[PDB]
């Protein structure tokens, strides 16, 4: 939904409504704001290899 994406890419009434979106799709929740990426697109670019970062489940 580009309604809230077209809303939140503008300066607002307060500075406390600047909640986190993915900057590729319109997903609001589980957005890793270190990456500014969501739950799903970080998995997709992790599996394609266009983030520099391994998968190791070897802890």
């Amino acid at each position: 939904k580009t309604s809230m994406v077209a809303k939140q890419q503008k300066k607002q009434k307060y500075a406390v409504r600047e909640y986190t979106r993915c900057e590729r799709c319109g997903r609001p929740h589980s957005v890793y704001r270190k990456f500014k990426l969501c739950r799903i697109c970080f998995r997709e670019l992790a599996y394609k290899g266009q983030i520099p970062g391994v998968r190791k489940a070897s802890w």
């Binding site: 589980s30 890793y32 739950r39 799903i40 970080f42 998995r43 992790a46 520099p52 970062g53 391994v54 998968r55 190791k56 489940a57 070897s58 802890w59």
Partner: protein, 97 residues
């Protein structure tokens, strides 16, 4: 002594830079200590694997950042020129001390 904080993600580019910079300081100077490694503590991102349901199966992605510390004791003025001349690892992060 000056130090560099040789900081990559993988070990495949940190060994070529740690072979390049150390032997550049050996062939242009004297008594440079080796690429002493850090513990390289990593960052684990744990997501659910699914889209809508299913927190019963999850997915790990870790991000390791390897760090070597190289000490040049008594640095020659040819060494501080010749380390900044050739720059070809293309993806390591160098800090100067």
């Amino acid at each position: 002594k000056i130090r560099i904080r040789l900081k990559a993600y993988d070990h495949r580019v940190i060994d070529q830079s740690a072979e390049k910079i150390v032997e550049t300081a050996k062939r242009s100077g004297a008594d440079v200590s080796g690429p002493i490694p850090l513990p390289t503590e990593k960052s684990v991102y744990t997501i659910i694997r699914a889209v809508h349901m299913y927190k019963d199966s999850r997915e790990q992605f870790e991000q390791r950042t390897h760090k070597r510390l190289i000490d040049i004791v008594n640095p020659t003025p040819k060494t501080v020129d010749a380390l900044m001349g050739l720059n070809l690892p293309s993806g390591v992060d160098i800090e100067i001390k």
